[model samples]
Target chain A: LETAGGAELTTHSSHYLVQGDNSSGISDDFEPKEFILTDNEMEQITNEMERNHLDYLRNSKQVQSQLQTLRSEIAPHKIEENQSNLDILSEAQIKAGENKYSTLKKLKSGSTKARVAFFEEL
Target chain B: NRSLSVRVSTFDSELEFKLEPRASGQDLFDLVCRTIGLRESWYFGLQYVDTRSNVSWLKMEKRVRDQRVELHASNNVYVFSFYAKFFPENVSEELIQEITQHLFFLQVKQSILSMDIYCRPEASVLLASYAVHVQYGPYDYETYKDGMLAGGELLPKGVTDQYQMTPEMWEERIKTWYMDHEPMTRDEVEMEYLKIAQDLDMYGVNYFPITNKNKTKLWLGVTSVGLNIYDERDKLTPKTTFQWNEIRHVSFDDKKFTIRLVDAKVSNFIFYSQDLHINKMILDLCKGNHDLYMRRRKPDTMEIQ
Candidate 1:
């Protein structure tokens, strides 16, 4: 939904965090323990923060830091597990890898100078 | 009033369905949702199997459970998030997760996966619901980009680059055209780079190379150079570069991750080149402008704001 001025109010949060320090096979900035706070909860927290002090809020949420870290760390093990399976699946994954090269090569034979450079798939 | 509930059965590894149309007295969409509720039985079945069976089967069943709930929405077509409730013998838990993760999200418009089981008004999203019959999945040289929505000739059946990138093609072209020679002249090499770059740019590629007079090592000695050139839109610009004798065709299969050194001539001295290092150094040189902008921008908002 757009705001009154037609500015986008929400960004599509499709991307997920694969929480862990070992981002060996994951995207950077992955936080596994991403807070799934509802809008009302967010507002409540904000209100609480404004009412009290920053230090009080920080002290109040004892589990928040650990929870966030845990969320970040938990995802990679699953991701890595998935990756190894993909490696196994890849054994059967047919690679026209070279065949694609050959076919594209063949098509290049017929391409006009423009087409030969790199024909966009229609 | 008619209602719809779907029951899937497998006999000797073949999937069969039982549909209760009367139970779901709703429109097609609501019927689909009802069918989804009915699909929960698979999860139940998986849970049951896991408890009663061995650990391995339990893991597989968990994977099957996770494979559930796919979205048929157009924009989210590339996102193949599945939690399978059943697992074949070879189906590992990790494999299930990897496949599910990989299935999510369409990379580009008219990309190869866009052609496969992606959402179309005519094609059923239920296609993904069914177990991919191992034997029936088509295997062809041109059908590489088979599974996703990207239509037309399948280049190969794989992930990452199911579609062709010109730089790879250019790599071969360069190999064929000028590998034997010690060094090609600036004009001769630039001619090829220009052709590749223009082709890439036309196809929504935003990045190109920044090389000295004689283009020797295509940025990094990597055969396939990684370039993030953005047009105003910030899409990846198509780019190609050559790594002279400084680099060899290390391996095409591993295009990413592994780093190979390429030679770059800096002031007539042959030196190993790393784009990030050079880019950072260049950015450092422009520190005066950086300081003003850096200070004004809040450290928090510096990333994107």
Candidate 2:
């Protein structure tokens, strides 16, 4: 169904005003044709082009900023840092192991000598 | 009663054509090309300089159904001109603005090809959001809330439904669902966008004009999934696309490029180019895309010692 739309929906219309022509088959003429334009059509194209250009700049900046953000989030340094922390955590867990529950007693009101013994034994 | 006279001209030649009340831009283009005897028509389009002195291409398919193309009444002399398509080596603001759509389409196409969705997150974000808008039609919050609470089917697919949640929770969950649908790899992303683009169908048909075997002119549409060729002679015939997997081989000779298909019924098609350089260029571009399309996938896990 037909419906009203934006400027993009504007269909066939003369793009420029023409001035002259010559009729001949297998023509070899090579000269720029004289053209004319009303003030309004001229302004529209000019403004549209300017608007389009600004949009390009705006979009490019947004795209670049997004890419930069994504890169930083998944950067190699961040990955390495994460891996290092994981390694440290793994080692800490292994050091505690099954004695983690038993270590609670030493951590509590155990004697200093007993605590030292427990720590050294592990 | 309703007709416009316009002079269509090239650098070296000029011709006059009458614009019928219901004529299309393509009709005028055909008349001008025929009159001018332009042999190598690809890369050239009708252009007109606007008031701002910016040259704009006259799109061929645009139709004038009712409104008369307004022109100056004193002389009514409009110079419809031709221009060769070329991107300036320099990136001027005017040029950038003028060719924004052209540049944007190429950017999207390349991003899809490389599977670099993250590289241009803005485009991916825009496209996905647009797709959702298309999917849901016009969004009314109340209607969505009702749909989520009552039907529950309106809610995104992945969220577990056994645990009932508030409408606000559902809204938050659904808002993030589009991101969840992103493909994991380049191939996946390309295919995903291809389907999305097919659904949107806004960019219009992309034509890579070339001559097939027997010198018949055809326009090629190289897609993420396959290669499509359209016959210029019969616009009504359905364009045929051969998927990358179905292509047996692609080869090129001095002035001819050939595609052999897996299907026996379809004959091997030979395409002739105007020159060896153009042929090589097309073959190289095609080969680059074909290689990506035909690449073997890596296994999910690799056993290590």
Q: Candidate 1 — what's its lDDT? A: 0.25
Per-residue CA lDDT of candidate 2, range B1-305, in tens?
Answer: 56767787564456777788667666776777567554334334555654444444554555633223334542765566665432111123212222232333334444343432211222334344333433554345555543332213332221122223454544443344334444344333333344333222112223356675456577665543345555654221213455454566677788677777655565666666566545544554444344323221111111111
Off-target runs (Cα >4 Å) in candidate 1 are: A1-122, B1-95, B98-105, B108-110, B113-213, B216-305
Q: For every model shown, what is its TM-score relative to the native structure?
A: 0.17, 0.26
User: What TM-score describes the B chain of model 1?
Assistant: 0.17
* Candidate 1, A53-116: lDDT as tens digits: 3343365364334333433333233333333332333222223222212332344244132321
Give the Å error, residue A72, model 1.
52
Error of 1 at A71 (Å): 50
DockQ of candidate 1 is 0.01
- Please tell me the TM-score of chain A for candidate 2: 0.27
